[PDB]
Amino acid sequence: KPKEPVQVPKLLIKGGVEVLEVKTGVDAITEVECFLNPEMGDPDENLRGFSLKLSAENDFSSDSPERKMLPCYSTARIPLPNLNEDLTCGNLLMWEAVTVQTEVIGITSMLNLHAGSQKVHEHGGGKPIQGSNFHFFAVGGDPLEMQGVLMNYRTKYPDGTITPKNPTAQSQVMNTDHKAYLDKNNAYPVECWVPDPSRNENTRYFGTFTGGENVPPVLHVTNTATTVLLDEQGVGPLCKADSLYVSAADICGLFTNSSGTQQWRGLARYFKIRLRKRSVKNPYPISFLLSDLINRRTQRVDGQPMYGMESQVEEVRVFDGTERLPGDPDMIRYIDKQGQLQT
Amino acid sequence: PKKPKEPVQVPKLLIKGGVEVLEVKTGVDAITEVECFLNPEMGDPDENLRGFSLKLSAENDFSSDSPERKMLPCYSTARIPLPNLNEDLTCGNLLMWEAVTVQTEVIGITSMLNLHAGSQKVHEHGGGKPIQGSNFHFFAVGGDPLEMQGVLMNYRTKYPDGTITPKNPTAQSQVMNTDHKAYLDKNNAYPVECWVPDPSRNENTRYFGTFTGGENVPPVLHVTNTATTVLLDEQGVGPLCKADSLYVSAADICGLFTNSSGTQQWRGLARYFKIRLRKRSVKNPYPISFLLSDLINRRTQRVDGQPMYGMESQVEEVRVFDGTERLPGDPDMIRYIDKQGQLQTK
Amino acid sequence: RRTQRVDGQPMYGMESQVEEVRVFDGTERLPGDPDMIRYIDKQGQLQTK
Amino acid sequence: PKKPKEPVQVPKLLIKGGVEVLEVKTGVDAITEVECFL
Known part of the structure; x- marks a missing residue:
């Protein structure tokens, strides 16, 4: 006697990008194999x-790069069906994105020494590509909200580049006023925009950096990760929204040329984003649509500000519950805010 | 149309916002999260x-080495207030x-790719040289200031006066010495080459750090928001x-970093934190006779009496009668308590 | 009154640095809009001229 | 409303000082922690 085969997720449809809009059951799985x-x-x-x-030899006093000389992040979008x-x-x-899998395409293209x-x-061969690497990817339902950091605030960028605003010495440290979004392929230069570690509740990013003058680049290729x-x-x-942002x-x-000019080099990247279906609270009830109905039509009012740095709302007492009459009207909360400490 | 499967309970957000959020009356099981940089x-x-x-x-002398204050890295420090648990x-x-879980992540790591x-x-005809050399990374989270140890090298160097250095170094100070302690309470004055954390005293913080010295090694950075x-x-x-304070x-x-004429100089970046908090039920350690101890001593006058404490006392003899017993056939005896029992010699 | 006086970086006031202070107490069904914004038009955009 | 819990037991500290704590008689289950230098 043998043994009745074991069970396995009965595979269904397959094909190109237009497979997605075919509706499925309630416990569907999906596997999306795509690149950049x-x-x-x-x-x-x-x-x-x-x-x-x-x-x-551009000095700090005046920097004049071009659009070509700066690499940029790569981004795209995947349309999705709606479900309700x-x-x-x-x-x-x-x-819901659950399991990613990355793999670099073309890693053996570096063995060219002719x-x-x-x-x-x-009388030897040539010099292969060496130096600093920076590999980086990200999977989320939203654009990758990122932090503005640079050095040498006197750099004047080319006008095709989305670069942060009003450069000061404060931009060379963690500043708060260089926030933006990532909404465009091939426009955000990589020497000026790290991922913001504060704002991402719907974006997971992975990145390993290794600088140095001439260090080896170490690459893996494995379909068990x-x-x-x-x-x-x-x-x-x-x-x-009905999207999935990569x-x-x-x-x-x-890369070093035969005379001495240096020039950069990169490769593509694989993705396998398993998706599935979940059950959440509605973030769009009829009450949200009703307010967005009226707020489209109602007249714009432009007065003095009531939010922000130059605001004018001063003290707001949000109180509901009752309590035994306090023996102080103005109770204080911090014990010593500024500090009258020792020494 | 069948109803969906009922969702999964998560903890309920109640208020997001600026620094004025901590002043909310909550219940008992409140937990906060504080995102801060330095x-x-x-x-x-x-x-x-x-x-x-x-x-x-x-290259200076080993004896007449006199740096200036504008070329030394220093420890960055800050204090976060908290409201009372009244x-x-x-x-x-x-x-x-209580500060349960930290999560650090270096901000600004791709500025070093800018080779021009x-x-x-x-x-x-090549490009620019990236930053390489000795790196150093160190952070610390705790309820008390980072009590740190005095270690320096070449004690005959004359520091400038913006800095706080160990007082009176000898040749013995270049290894483990005791008389060079300090707290950490002043930004941009504690130099990196003169202080390390004390392993003996800090029951209340947690410091992490690593070091690699070298002429030319690659700085390895590692960024991930799931660690x-x-x-x-x-x-x-x-x-x-x-105390209601949080020292980070x-x-x-x-x-x-090499400049245009070929001079190496240093490079620092910022650091992110995310401290999760919670309320612990602790007990009181000190005795009940403490509040009064101070309250009386800030109202009653200071008296310059003829002294009665220490090696200049003028009390002759003190006795403590307690309880009762039979007659002691000697009145010139001496009785005391040795360590736990009642002993009596001649 | 018996702890050391630190004067470091200003974690309160106009140029304070603490950004995102969540507070939690209880339980809730899973919100499908994680950056839970509340004012449907805080700025005043997208209105009638 | 809701009541916060009782504390959780930790082992009691008994003594501390210089190197001359190494003279005091101890119990049966007395677990030192000797910090030193070289």
């Missing part, structure tokens, strides 16, 4: 995958 | 070149704020806040 294009700048002569040569059909007051039914590299010594994107509460990146950027190191 | 104070050689050091002194416990129990920032040219660093001890308590001190040095 790295944006290294792409100079001329169809060398799509390098950058232009780097500047050598009738009203169904109460609860809704959204998507290229236009520098002759490394007199698995990175769980669940949090410590039991959710993944939820999809508020953002990444891959730097591989510097 | 500035690095690397020296600031002028107002225009924020976050750096000045150009380094190359509560109603019985038998002298209290409620204080006035470095010395690396070869013939979680736990701050519990063997018994199950984090940092308690004795941290310092970061990334490496060495």
